Amino acid sequence: AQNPNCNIMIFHPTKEEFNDFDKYIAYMESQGAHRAGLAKIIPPKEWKARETYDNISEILIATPLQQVASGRAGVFTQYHKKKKAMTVGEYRHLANSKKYQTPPHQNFEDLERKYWKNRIYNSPIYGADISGSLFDENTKQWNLGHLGTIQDLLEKECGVVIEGVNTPYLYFGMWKTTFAWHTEDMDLYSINYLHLGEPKTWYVVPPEHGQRLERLARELFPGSSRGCGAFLRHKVALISPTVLKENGIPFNRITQEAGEFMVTFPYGYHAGFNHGFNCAEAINFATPRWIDYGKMASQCSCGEARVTFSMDAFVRILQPERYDLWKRGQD
Numbered sequence: 469a470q471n472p473n474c475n476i477m478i479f480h481p482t483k484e485e486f487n488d489f490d491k492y493i494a495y496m497e498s499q500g501a502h503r504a505g506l507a508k509i510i511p512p513k514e515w516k517a518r519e520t521y522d523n524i525s526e527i528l529i530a531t532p533l534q535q536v537a538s539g540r541a542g543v544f545t546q547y548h549k550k551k552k553a554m555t556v557g558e559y560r561h562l563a564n565s566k567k568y569q570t571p572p573h574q575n576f577e578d579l580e581r582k583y584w585k586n587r588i589y590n591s592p593i594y595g596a597d598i599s600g601s602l603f604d605e606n607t608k609q610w611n612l613g614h615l616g617t618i619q620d621l622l623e624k625e626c627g628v629v630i631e632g633v634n635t636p637y638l639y640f641g642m643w644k645t646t647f648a649w650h651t652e653d654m655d656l657y658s659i660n661y662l663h664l665g666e667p668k669t670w671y672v673v674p675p676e677h678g679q680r681l682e683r684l685a686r687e688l689f690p691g692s693s694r695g696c697g698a699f700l701r702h703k704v705a706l707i708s709p710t711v712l713k714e715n716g717i718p719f720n721r722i723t724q725e726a727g728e729f730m731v732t733f734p735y736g737y738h739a740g741f742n743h744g745f746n747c748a749e750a751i752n753f754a755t756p757r758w759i760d761y762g763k764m765a766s767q768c769s770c771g772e773a774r775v776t777f778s779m780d781a782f783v784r785i786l787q788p789e790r791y792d793l794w795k796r797g798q799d
């Protein structure tokens with residue numbers, strides 16, 4: 469069995485290997501990459517996402533979110549307070565202000581220590597989940613707006629045509645902005661490209677050990693667990709590496725830099741934080757190996773997680789027993 473320790477693998481495709489997205493994902497899996505839950509892909513040196521980032525300041529962040537923490541430094545929840553709209557140029561200036569800028573630090577490890585010691589004491593502002601793309605339309609390889617759609621994959625594998633669309637989303641971050649512990653909707657894959665700016669640190673639990681993370685989460689967040697059997701779908705819970713190590717949870721960590729892709733694999737729980745002003749683009753995708761994970765994915769029926777239009781069909785076809793309950797939570 470390849471990659472039995474479930475380490476995060478890093479890939480360097482050539483330009484020829486970069487031409488066929490599906491084939492390369494299947495290659496990475498042949499080497500055991502999925503066992504980690506996360507892989508890094510460094511594009512060939514001939515590739516670029518677009519020519520420059522000089523013309524992005526007029527993008528609007530309609531609903532910036534202030535991420536307010538509650539709990540203790542290693543075990544906390546965050547909620548999202550809506551703020552007034554601002555442009556990417558206004559957000560960048562805010563990110564670089566003395567109130568929000570990255571502190572002086574020695575290296576990534578020192579910054580990670582500072583994040584876990586100090587995150588809860590501040591409320592950074594995140595531009596999340598903005599529908600759109602920064603890939604040039606003439607970028608032909610690994611263009612996140614031109615991938616095969618999940619609805620087309622379900623049709624090819626299972627024969628059923630379904631409604632829905634699959635589009636990318638932008639993320640504008642600053643120091644301490646945080647993505648809470650989660651798997652993707654319907655335990656899909658994700659691909660994430662860091663277009664510009666400062667790094668993003670990731671934590672991940674191997675898919676084969678996901679239930680260990682869920683059990684610890686129910687212990688650490690006992691009221692949230694009573695409220696919802698799939699409360700990590702709310703995307704609010706943070707647990708530090710130190711706490712994970714104290715509780716014997718298997719995980720890995722890696723830092724993504726500008727110009728790099730990360731792939732998350734079905735049922736790979738992940739969390740992380742931004743080092744400073746940055747912009748990432750992400751989208752969900754599927755392969756034939758996802759289908760069996762999609763059939764088994766948990767679902768939030770409490771009302772909180774409130775998702776996309778296109779998840780309806782996935783629940784309806786893959787999880788018909790759960791459909792009625794899950795839809796009552798959506799309405």
Ligand SMILES: O=C(O)CNC(=O)C(=O)O
Pocket residue numbers: 639646647658659660668732748750751
């Ligand atoms: O960058 C983000 O805020 C978080 N990314 C992801 O959850 C992803 O691409 O799977």
Ligand SMILES: [Mg+2]
Pocket residue numbers: 523524525526527
């Ligand atoms: Mg612009």
Ligand code: NI
Pocket residue numbers: 651652658732738
């Ligand atoms: Ni994700």
Ligand SMILES: [Zn+2]
Pocket residue numbers: 695696697698699701702768769770771772773
């Ligand atoms: Zn819920």
